[PDB]
Design an enzyme around this catalytic site. Sequence first.
Site, PDB file in Angstrom:
ATOM      1  N   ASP A   1      10.995  11.121  -4.767  1.00  0.00           N
ATOM      2  CA  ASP A   1       9.592  11.505  -4.688  1.00  0.00           C
ATOM      3  C   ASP A   1       9.322  12.152  -3.328  1.00  0.00           C
ATOM      4  O   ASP A   1       8.382  11.792  -2.621  1.00  0.00           O
ATOM      5  CB  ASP A   1       8.722  10.272  -4.955  1.00  0.00           C
ATOM      6  CG  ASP A   1       7.248  10.600  -5.203  1.00  0.00           C
ATOM      7  OD1 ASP A   1       6.951  11.604  -5.890  1.00  0.00           O
ATOM      8  OD2 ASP A   1       6.374   9.827  -4.726  1.00  0.00           O
TER       9      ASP A   1
ATOM     10  N   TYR B   1       0.537   3.846  -8.249  1.00  0.00           N
ATOM     11  CA  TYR B   1       1.267   2.585  -8.300  1.00  0.00           C
ATOM     12  C   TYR B   1       0.858   1.579  -7.224  1.00  0.00           C
ATOM     13  O   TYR B   1       1.382   0.458  -7.217  1.00  0.00           O
ATOM     14  CB  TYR B   1       2.780   2.854  -8.192  1.00  0.00           C
ATOM     15  CG  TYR B   1       3.317   3.785  -9.262  1.00  0.00           C
ATOM     16  CD1 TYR B   1       3.262   3.439 -10.614  1.00  0.00           C
ATOM     17  CD2 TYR B   1       3.860   5.020  -8.925  1.00  0.00           C
ATOM     18  CE1 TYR B   1       3.752   4.301 -11.607  1.00  0.00           C
ATOM     19  CE2 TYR B   1       4.352   5.889  -9.905  1.00  0.00           C
ATOM     20  CZ  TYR B   1       4.297   5.527 -11.245  1.00  0.00           C
ATOM     21  OH  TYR B   1       4.785   6.391 -12.210  1.00  0.00           O
TER      22      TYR B   1
ATOM     23  N   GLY C   1      -5.574   4.764   1.284  1.00  0.00           N
ATOM     24  CA  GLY C   1      -5.269   5.562   0.110  1.00  0.00           C
ATOM     25  C   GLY C   1      -5.150   4.716  -1.135  1.00  0.00           C
ATOM     26  O   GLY C   1      -4.787   3.537  -1.079  1.00  0.00           O
TER      27      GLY C   1
ATOM     28  N   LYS D   1       0.366  -2.525   1.641  1.00  0.00           N
ATOM     29  CA  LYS D   1       0.447  -1.772   0.387  1.00  0.00           C
ATOM     30  C   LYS D   1       0.379  -2.755  -0.775  1.00  0.00           C
ATOM     31  O   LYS D   1       1.332  -3.492  -1.041  1.00  0.00           O
ATOM     32  CB  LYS D   1       1.718  -0.920   0.326  1.00  0.00           C
ATOM     33  CG  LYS D   1       2.045  -0.406  -1.079  1.00  0.00           C
ATOM     34  CD  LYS D   1       2.819   0.908  -1.084  1.00  0.00           C
ATOM     35  CE  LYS D   1       4.310   0.724  -1.232  1.00  0.00           C
ATOM     36  NZ  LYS D   1       4.899   1.861  -1.993  1.00  0.00           N
TER      37      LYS D   1
ATOM     38  N   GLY E   1      -3.100   5.107  -4.808  1.00  0.00           N
ATOM     39  CA  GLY E   1      -2.084   5.874  -5.510  1.00  0.00           C
ATOM     40  C   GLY E   1      -2.033   5.538  -6.988  1.00  0.00           C
ATOM     41  O   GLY E   1      -2.905   4.818  -7.492  1.00  0.00           O
TER      42      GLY E   1
HETATM   43  C1  LIG Z   1       5.180  19.815  10.426  1.00  0.00           C
HETATM   44  O1  LIG Z   1       5.189  20.031   9.016  1.00  0.00           O
HETATM   45  C2  LIG Z   1       6.399  19.871   8.422  1.00  0.00           C
HETATM   46  C3  LIG Z   1       7.501  20.554   8.911  1.00  0.00           C
HETATM   47  C4  LIG Z   1       8.716  20.378   8.302  1.00  0.00           C
HETATM   48  C5  LIG Z   1       8.821  19.521   7.209  1.00  0.00           C
HETATM   49  C6  LIG Z   1       7.717  18.839   6.720  1.00  0.00           C
HETATM   50  C7  LIG Z   1       6.470  19.001   7.312  1.00  0.00           C
HETATM   51  C8  LIG Z   1       5.293  18.272   6.803  1.00  0.00           C
HETATM   52  C9  LIG Z   1       4.447  18.866   5.862  1.00  0.00           C
HETATM   53  C10 LIG Z   1       3.332  18.173   5.364  1.00  0.00           C
HETATM   54  C11 LIG Z   1       3.011  16.857   5.787  1.00  0.00           C
HETATM   55  C12 LIG Z   1       1.796  16.089   5.227  1.00  0.00           C
HETATM   56  N1  LIG Z   1       1.155  15.011   5.995  1.00  0.00           N
HETATM   57  C13 LIG Z   1       1.543  13.643   5.620  1.00  0.00           C
HETATM   58  C14 LIG Z   1       0.910  13.028   4.370  1.00  0.00           C
HETATM   59  C15 LIG Z   1      -0.012  11.803   4.606  1.00  0.00           C
HETATM   60  O2  LIG Z   1      -0.678  11.696   5.629  1.00  0.00           O
HETATM   61  N2  LIG Z   1      -0.105  10.824   3.630  1.00  0.00           N
HETATM   62  C16 LIG Z   1      -0.967   9.657   3.807  1.00  0.00           C
HETATM   63  C17 LIG Z   1      -1.473   9.026   2.510  1.00  0.00           C
HETATM   64  C18 LIG Z   1      -1.878   7.540   2.663  1.00  0.00           C
HETATM   65  C19 LIG Z   1      -1.930   7.115   4.143  1.00  0.00           C
HETATM   66  N3  LIG Z   1      -1.658   5.732   4.346  1.00  0.00           N
HETATM   67  C20 LIG Z   1      -0.359   5.197   4.518  1.00  0.00           C
HETATM   68  N4  LIG Z   1       0.425   4.937   3.513  1.00  0.00           N
HETATM   69  C21 LIG Z   1       1.694   4.370   3.773  1.00  0.00           C
HETATM   70  C22 LIG Z   1       2.522   4.111   2.675  1.00  0.00           C
HETATM   71  C23 LIG Z   1       3.753   3.570   2.840  1.00  0.00           C
HETATM   72  C24 LIG Z   1       4.668   3.306   1.666  1.00  0.00           C
HETATM   73  O3  LIG Z   1       4.147   3.371   0.534  1.00  0.00           O
HETATM   74  O4  LIG Z   1       5.856   3.090   1.937  1.00  0.00           O
HETATM   75  C25 LIG Z   1       4.218   3.263   4.129  1.00  0.00           C
HETATM   76  C26 LIG Z   1       3.432   3.504   5.240  1.00  0.00           C
HETATM   77  C27 LIG Z   1       2.156   4.064   5.087  1.00  0.00           C
HETATM   78  C28 LIG Z   1       1.291   4.347   6.183  1.00  0.00           C
HETATM   79  C29 LIG Z   1       1.648   4.074   7.551  1.00  0.00           C
HETATM   80  N5  LIG Z   1       0.830   4.329   8.618  1.00  0.00           N
HETATM   81  C30 LIG Z   1      -0.418   4.880   8.348  1.00  0.00           C
HETATM   82  C31 LIG Z   1      -0.858   5.186   7.051  1.00  0.00           C
HETATM   83  C32 LIG Z   1       0.005   4.917   5.938  1.00  0.00           C
HETATM   84  C33 LIG Z   1       3.871  16.289   6.719  1.00  0.00           C
HETATM   85  C34 LIG Z   1       4.996  16.984   7.215  1.00  0.00           C
END
Ligand SMILES: COc1ccccc1-c1ccc(CNCCC(=O)NCCCCNc2nc3cc(C(=O)O)ccc3c3cnccc23)cc1
Length: 330
Positions: free
Chosen positions: A154, A48, A44, A66, A46
Amino acid sequence: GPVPSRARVYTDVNTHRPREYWDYESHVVEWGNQDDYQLVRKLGRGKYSEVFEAINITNNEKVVVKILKPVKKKKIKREIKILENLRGGPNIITLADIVKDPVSRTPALVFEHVNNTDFKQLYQTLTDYDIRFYMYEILKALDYCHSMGIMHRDVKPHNVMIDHEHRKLRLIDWGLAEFYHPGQEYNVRVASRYFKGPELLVDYQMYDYSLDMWSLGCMLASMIFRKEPFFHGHDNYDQLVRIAKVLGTEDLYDYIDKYNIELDPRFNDILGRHSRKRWERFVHSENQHLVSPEALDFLDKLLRYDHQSRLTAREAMEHPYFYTVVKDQA
Ligand SMILES: COc1ccccc1-c1ccc(CNCCC(=O)NCCCCNc2nc3cc(C(=O)O)ccc3c3cnccc23)cc1
């Protein structure tokens, strides 16, 4: 001027700590060598940061790097210090390491990898139980960091990572988080537009943890009504109009009066007169299987203008909505 405000839980947690806990500005960082990690692919970009999948070449272990886009050095020490303070908290992401590329010198944070369930595998077979289960898990993370005198600021779907096969969740991206100090006036231009509490939208700067509970209610509405996002505004001004057409205009101006918020003259002739709706108008055949008197009650008690009247995270966890998931966990 504006009537002041205090968090009603964990108000002074930080004052009773050693300076070094919250004085991040003076925190010494030890930057390692990013070559210990080898980038696999971009995951990804972002505003920042830029995130990459990487391998830890010492033990072949899968990791996430990151790379921090250029900010004031304070905001890097802030994020780092908050991650160190939260390390090992329930459902907080874990900071694995802190490094600099040796030739480029741009700072980067290394995190644990979470396997992400496809959104089209999650959304389709979402039960009423799945929403309660993970909602309970987010509140564990939120009540913890609040108890440690931190606000996330956030909270949005992008920053909640879920491994459904292992039924484990992780709150990520702490780059906007701050320490709570009673009386501090904070920057309102944080979080993503759809999830901004009304306190940001009106420039009430003395907010607190309850900001994070508005965002979570925004998520809860988005899920049980099968409407993504729930408050779908064109800009930061229309966002309040989108909110006001649901919560009503009456509680808004009482909110404005109670804190004597001087409201932007842009808002005068755009909000209007709006009754507070009954939540039932948002249910329909293709979403009612997630809606219940319990979920409705819980939803109502998160989306309040007045940040003081929103449930705390530990108040949320004791709500009847979670009674089945509380007992199955024992
Ligand atoms: C079951 O529904 C729910 C029920 C109740 C409440 C909530 C929900 C619910 C709703 C929607 C979602 C959306 N769905 C996740 C969004 C997503 O997938 N967004 C990745 C974007 C970059 C991906 N890349 C990574 N960015 C990172 C950044 C940091 C940091 O900046 O700290 C730290 C670790 C990582 C990381 C770790 N491992 C793999 C990939 C990444 C999740 C749950």
